[PDB]
């Protein structure tokens, strides 16, 4: 966390800084989108 790293979760590739937000991803939700309809939040598929 708090470091610029490359993410790869269920094909949602990209580069960003990992942080902890209040996003409550349900068991079915894959990834979150920002105002620009771009991936801004993902979930570890191995463990919730």
């Amino acid at each position: 966390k708090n470091k610029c790293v490359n993410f790869n979760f269920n094909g949602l590739t990209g580069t960003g800084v990992l942080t902890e937000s209040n996003k409550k991803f349900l068991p079915f939700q894959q990834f979150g989108r920002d105002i620009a309809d771009t991936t801004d939040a993902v979930r570890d598929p191995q463990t919730l």
Binding site: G14, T15, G16, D34, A36, T38, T39, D40
Partner: protein
């Protein structure tokens, strides 16, 4: 009299977490820097 001071990054704005986007954006030349100087120039113009 003036507006609120802001700093919008041309690279992240045009290309939100995308590597291939930045590769083609750099081919356009200084239009990225002009976007920063444009929005910043407005803020500097309000300071004038």
């Amino acid at each position: 009299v003036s507006m609120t001071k802001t700093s919008v990054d041309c690279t992240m704005y045009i290309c939100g977490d995308s590597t291939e986007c930045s590769n083609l954006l750099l081919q356009y030349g200084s239009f990225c820097t002009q976007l920063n100087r444009a929005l910043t120039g407005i803020a500097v113009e309000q300071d004038k």
